[model samples]
Target: AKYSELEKGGVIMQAFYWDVPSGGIWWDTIRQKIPEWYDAGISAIWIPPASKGMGGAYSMGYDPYDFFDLGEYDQKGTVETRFGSKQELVNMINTAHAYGMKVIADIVINHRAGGDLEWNPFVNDYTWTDFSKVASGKYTANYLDFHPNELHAGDSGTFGGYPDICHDKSWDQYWLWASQESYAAYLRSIGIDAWRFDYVKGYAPWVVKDWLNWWGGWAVGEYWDTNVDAVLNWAYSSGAKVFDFALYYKMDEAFDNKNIPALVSALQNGQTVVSRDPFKAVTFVANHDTDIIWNKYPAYAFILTYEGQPTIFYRDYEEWLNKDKLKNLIWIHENLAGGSTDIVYYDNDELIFVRNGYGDKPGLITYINLGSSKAGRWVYVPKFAGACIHEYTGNLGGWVDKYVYSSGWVYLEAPAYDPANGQYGYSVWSYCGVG
Candidate 1:
């Protein structure tokens, strides 16, 4: 199968907020914005959970009630979801595909909500009935489909008091496998390009690989863990892309404390997604769980330049109006800053690096300043003598048109920390437009 445009170093956009709305078809809004997102260089949009949540019309879709009822069934408090109608979702998917953007649906497969427990004549008492009862005509599932309270693995705890799906028991695993297969087919039928597996830690990592096989498209699992080793292990074991929790933590450490060099060490070791493997890494400055706000622009700058599939939060793009900045970074990532990485210079408050492109490929030089000014600091570039290089985006302190005449040494400068100062720990890109 031919790879989608996403394979060529494209970006993903997380397209919804925590409490967006629930009156009408919010997916209609998405359909309207497809062209803008496409123009912004976003190759994929990660839509929030598609299934109906117990919270009904205003639910965030985490506490999944019905897998089949995508705002069509009247099981939830209302027929329409916070997102939109089922048909509107289909329309959104079609709109995304039309604009060459893949739609990645958030699949909340870890646990289920609104399962049945009504008094039945067979038992003459209230008992936990089938989860399939939530969507009987479509999916027939029972309490046996879930993990018993005794069965445990990975992050062994029931999520929000919801029943966890045990992939361990044969009966439970069989039903879960069946559900994924059906769900994957349904997604493809509706033109969804991939899935974002939610709460993957509830089950074994290997189960993720199996689900991927069923899904038959690109996927990134939310294996939430700040432990670098755990992220690495899951990345290897699941054989699927994972959200780089390890990198996110390191990003906070590097940016929050003005310790820019810490990023170099994180990337040098397997502490970050790009460091371990780019293809298996889904990098993001922040997500729905983490606020896109805060002083995280440098973190975005780093991920967009470095390896890994960078994902953008919608709030950051639309609300904050950082779209242009992010778009430029995406362009640089696709066109210049890929192939390989080499640390050029590093310090507690400054970090600079060179991206050596595919053999003989003219690469780029990137620098981030977190501390005081370096009006005369000479950072090394991979250019030859007299090779003129110019800054692309970061031209904070008289950096624009400030060409580097020498090959190995490039003039570097940053500003003081005073808010009134024009230059304050900004980033710079030194590229020759050759590659």
Candidate 2:
């Protein structure tokens, strides 16, 4: 089911990147990091596809060959999937759950591959549509379960020349239902708390809606569209949260052009999915499909302080970026970043905003400077009048403090953007009383 709202300060970590080293190291690698990840305020991990794919040990798991085989069966020319054995996956999930972190499984139900070749009169050629070799035989499909069958035509577009499973086919519904039900049960049995549906556009929206009704849990779809309306339509129809591609593109464009006006305007006007529907928007700076942003610190600062539930790419956290700074941002996100955003000031090269305080948690003031030199301004934050606030990110030399005047005006400054020296100007300010 659609996640009604993400928990306060909740952040998801995309725990794996594309084409990570093969041969059973991924599960243990992440398993060992569970304690560290939980301590860093990461509430969830979005894991990669765990099923055996068409490429056996080489496949990235996107090309699904068997839904039931998660590095267990001997099919696909390997006993274990690319990630690891089934026992390792269970161990990782157990570790995450023990630390109060949710595990979101990457599910690929849109299509299937590695099927045995069989002659099909409908296509007038031999197609790879037989799944008799699947060791489990629980979710196996024949030629009629795919597109161009007698029961119905295709729903959405195809992917990678793989045979798309026609979920609308009445005769094939039983197999789909039984297979998916068992898969959901298996995931829950192994401590998977949520799901990330891959290639949602390749199937009908009701397919997900029905599945969610049967298997209720937090789920997000990979609609992969930059248009806000298109994504929202799918989100509402399927009752699933979607990646905020529109907002990502906006941020991408702003970073590419070295300006913040367009991004500021979009956020202020509620033109993006996250702005329009924060509850159903999974905001991300980069994922497996997209390149990391050039000015990623500022971008991360923006998302970590913004409205929607933010996701951190694993590559950025592991190798491409600074872990200490990211951990600080995550801490801020959990402790102080809350409520509606209040845009205080903006220009072509600068943007200043605030996350209005909610309940006991005091809000935050964020200043982003894209200019060549350090910048400061007097931003009015009435709620923080006569209150002392400090920069928590430590991006500056040290912990810096600023006092809000009784009139609610405080002078805030951010260092200049120097990509060569590894500095992208951004600052997050919160009440000094908070940790």
Candidate 3:
């Protein structure tokens, strides 16, 4: 369970997603669950905005009343959010750290939360979500949570990405924006090792850059688009790493398109990318929205299994909705695709390969099944190497044929079948630790 080493695992803890309705669940209930989270092999837990929120926006941890009084969320601050409380929260961090676990907190800076002057304490002393009671609220505990710039945008709605904050000519707004640095610094001082930015695209590069220079830690922005050229630009140019959405298109469309291509044609789609490491390319099949691959709303699990740094939300592992079978398919990328000797093959969906960290560690070779129709097929390999039959998925039974047995050349004729309801089925395989 070395967070520093390869083959390690991480999880996106639930509060905003699958388990929000339960955020109001009793404290004892939440407190008791941390241990189970630890036991489930989760090395890291990413929680959402912990501050108080607008009454109706309870599901979105984004609308908090006070940053300091993490108690401001709904449920009367009665329960520890589905994520637990200051006491249990501290305990969970200490416990997870005790077990060598990592903790990442969500940081929402896209738009300034609404009417914070109200909702002052988790109680009604402050005005409700409506803007009318702006007079009664007190200073937010996590006061630095936003910038005056977020408040001063005259064009809040004219643009997308984020709702502008309307930073008027008021000097008070400037002070508030300038004051944000101190506030963000305070949050980091409180044990948040990293951050998951909410509306990354909405923020200016200078804003993000200033935040990075100010905070100095690992952070990933939510740039949810599948365009290769644009995505790569944001990653390298913005000084902020981002969750990979282009890779999703590859997995979803090309993976199922063997003959019945769902949407996209290929994972990378032939667009060039500049990645510090493809592993750093935050990847996932689904999260709070879109589709949950494990739940069958998505087309296939095999693609998620093969993509980069496969991430999953807590609901996938929840006892009531166990998704480990689908999760286990991601083991190779989670555990094996690291170290030296990494090779890559990207040309067509029918033929994709990688030989990263073989022998010295887990080696991986992925075959993107882009066909919707099941046809016995043969693919070309760049070099020759030994491969063990993957008996776990049940997708591949006995080997069909082998050819080109030389030091740097070989091929396998694997049979892929059409999914019962899928466009088609192919495998993403690795594990050359042997041979």
Candidate 4:
């Protein structure tokens, strides 16, 4: 099914990270963890590039050499790609499907690497633009398919100094019909439910639009720009969702510099893509590119409870971080997070907000304190008036209970960040029945 928008309680997990162990064990590892991940409220899995890259067994799949080689042929150096063989990839996809989860394939079609050096009359030099060495002869390209060809120079800038594929060139319409279309069909045949376009700025937006229109699946692009306008322009033009880099930078700044007011302002005034267009925003605190975040728990709390679809990094969930607390936040996101967000109060060190209820799901009130001590305030929540509420996150020192006044106001307070005792300073409140 084509997912135009994320389901109400849905979340995506980027299943791999940079420099992961390069063996045939990655796909089986994912297969073993499907049940646990699904139980933890992850509805989608975004896998890395499956095709053979330039570095053979070591390549991270970004440097594309062959489009059809998914470890099925003897390409690059080995018959199996860095992750595994095509059979293993299919097995993983089937396992995810059995668990009712969607699989998103990482696509890198912007440039080609590890090609044969051939003389090109247009550039008047022998460049590594000939892809004749590709084992899968299905999508081989010559000098005419690359930049500075007889037709056009290039669309966007080159990535990694490799020969960029000139999508505008009309050499059998390779990019539009033969290469990308066939690759999309191949992925769909193997049960790939969605797409994650890598380095979208390296190509034109129309290519993405055409591919999405043809495939009709849940799609997102890695524009990798901090400007909200630039990201939004690509999103609107290509009809695909984008990573919320604007909000990510704000979170990074706020967490690194202890500037909570800037983040609060961005969240309150719709300065982020998710706030402006939640459906087209794939909200994340960090990804494989940016590595990690210092104040990740608080950032996860905000994204999981606030607007947009949140993506959890594999490293954060698999290593070092507390899985129990993360599970609690995911539960809150799946159960109580819904509707529009309304900020009740905010200052330099503290902020309180409410997600208005929608349908049968009761909304939640979140209080975040970045200061060194406990803070409290009486905020108006007409829907939650006279409702028995308690801290659901268990981060407020201990289980505390409070009742709202009939006048539609309640004094909410959260404990401060106590790193020595392992308290990260955040509280989520909900009705007593649900808590």
Candidate 5:
């Protein structure tokens, strides 16, 4: 397998809701934002669930009523989801792929909803399900298809009031495996190159691993646990990549405390996905659940420039106005980042770091100052003694370049201003080429 675009500076933009409000014309809106996203170096978009759910036109699609409908049928009492028509969803994926960005379909097979209930005589109550409403009973499942041998065993005794897909039984396992793989393949048939598993903890990890192996695309599982060891064990054992919640919690804690040294040490020696396995790590600052705790530019400066595939929250890009700053960071990553990571210097309020790219490939040196001096910090770049280094973003620039003399220790006076040039605050230098 060739190195995926994901391995080479791939930045994911989670382009939909996650406890946040989304637009009604979402598919059309996504189609229109293709150019802007591509220009910003966004390589992938994790869209909302394309299928119809119980919420009808208001569904975020997590309720997952009809697996076969993507605004193509009136199963959910509405022909179109909050996103748009089926044709519009196809258009968004097509347009995004045309611009070199992959589209990720949010496929929630953990449960189903909006089904008619009956007297099981076992549990003895009316449990909401998808058996009666979806596809006119074509693939309708019964209560036995759920987990813990019944239509029970979920968060608050039911997965958000939806029926949980049973993965323990051989019969239901076969049903779920076949059904999920089929739905994922359908999305792929429409040009989707990736998938976002809604809730992996709801089902077995083997189911997820088998799904990824069958689908054969870049995929991520949302385990959503804060336990570092438990999460890593789940992800590594599942054989599926997962978003690093452990890292996100630690990042939130350390970044807010302004302890760069602790942050650096954690990145190098922590139990986060990137530290354990960079290839499997999908790092993020915040998502729709926990929004805007860290300053966008500064927090992501460390994430985007460091290892692991960093995912940018839509709220940060659109709502927080970190678009241009993030774009520059993407360029820096594509051009001068990747490979081995090394910490040059760090303190309670500052950090100097270097990314040692693969054999003979150019890398980057970053100087971050969170101190109150506003005079920056003293940083050294010993390896790039004779290279023509330049600040890619920030500071005055028409493409400014400076030569690092071959002194025993090459020193530069780093500043703590806002770059004062429409760029981000932290000063970043890239090795354009040799002197």
Candidate 6:
């Protein structure tokens, strides 16, 4: 309710690791970075946790030692510590909006890190351990280690990974019942458009719906594994969007330089497997966990222009990685996805993509050379299967004059070019939409 501007097509920029505020991560110096991001065509910022964090060295804000106090003001007079106090956060949120950028806080709801749930606002035991005793505050489920028994992770997913959260449908009251207001209030007060729930599959979908029914804001969650059908069910019931981890994994994994075909296959299969609108699904190649786009998965550098909203991670663009290429991809994404309507021409091993910018006026068509084995003018039916017609290039013999409803489109790949400009990377050609 605080900010509705984010829903309108916008690029979500990652700005947490670039040295955040201390109290809960709100650096004024970076607060000024909003202008740069906005200028660079970034309309929204997904800053790291804005809530209270565990007081320690570099609290990625996940620790969350406290939820109320942003910690005492720091020496620099800047909210540079623990992300600054609550007051400082308010100022930053307002400032972000003033510059026309919506702020999205990244929250860890699996469980609180402080470990003292009893003294805390939500779970009193401070121990999200044992879903069985979630209310009793003394039970731990050693059986279903992943979710049914996720509490064994105890703020640490038993395996000692990121602490796990308990969102079981059964323990709603004991775990998330009373504190619902706090979570919603925190988000509302901070003026954020949405949140990226850390590990979604770890919890129950019904619980997700419960929270959505209350919070009433846009939210996208990270489904830990690759069960597409299950994710679809979860999305249908919860009404929250997903981060597309399954597609992300498949695309990034099989992408060996030829990053088109397999990705296209995933998209098609994803559509078949999952039920949510493809446009609503979040897309990204490199996030905090993966190698930066330029340094590692340079092939997937075109995710920005592919289809849905592409989240551009920051650290990937830092001087540590290939900053130049990072900037280029960012520019392409900002220029292409943000200002255009995306059209998926083909989606197999060889992915054919295009962007209709600003109402079909100026458009860019992208054909990814993701040939599994073969390359060169290879043709295949797109997701439309056959729903394509050539209004201009109908001169070609194979060009169809009618839309093939269930059939995807058939298209050719463009010749190669300098990968420097993302456009030249896979773009076959551009045709002006005008007569």
Best-performing candidate as measured by lDDT = 2
Better of 2 and 3 by lDDT: 2
Q: Arrange candidates by lDDT, descending.
A: 2, 4, 1, 5, 6, 3
RMSD of each: 3.8, 2.5, 6.8, 2.4, 3.3, 8.8
TM-score against truth, every candidate = 0.88, 0.95, 0.69, 0.95, 0.89, 0.66
Q: Which of 4 and 6 is the better model by TM-score?
A: 4
lDDT of candidate 5 vs native?
0.70
Candidate 4 displacement at residue 233 in angstroms: 1.4
lDDT of each: 0.70, 0.84, 0.46, 0.83, 0.70, 0.51
Badly placed stretches (over 4 Å) of model 4 are 1-9, 170-181
TM-score, cand. 4 vs. native = 0.95
Model 2 C-alpha lDDT per residue in residues 102-219, reported as the tens digit of each score: 8899988888899999998778888899987789777677788888888666777889999988887654555544444577777776788888999998988898787778777788
Q: Highest TM-score: which candidate?
A: 2
Off by over 4 Å in 2: 1-9, 170-181, 419-422
Candidate 3: tens digits of C-alpha lDDT, residues 1-435: 332222232433442364465454423343455565555444555666765444433435565434444443333334344444556566555665666656567776555445535342333244322333322233322222322233342331222222233323233233223355344654555566666777666655455566667666666777767666666566666576667666555545543343323322343344312123454466665677565233231332433433344455555455433254444444443454444322243333454445455334454444544445543434444333544433223345433334333343444333343444432244544433232
- Model 3 residue 10 CA deviation in Å: 6.2
Comparing 1 with 2 on lDDT, the higher-scoring candidate is 2
**Global local distance difference test of model 3:** 0.46
Residue-level lDDT for 364 in candidate 2: 93
Residue lDDT tens for model 5, 311-332: 8888778777557777777777
Q: Tell me the TM-score of model 2.
A: 0.95
Q: Report lDDT (Cα) of residue 383, candidate 3.
A: 36
Task: State which candidate, 3 or 4, has the greater TM-score.
Answer: 4
Candidate 2 achieves a global lDDT of 0.84
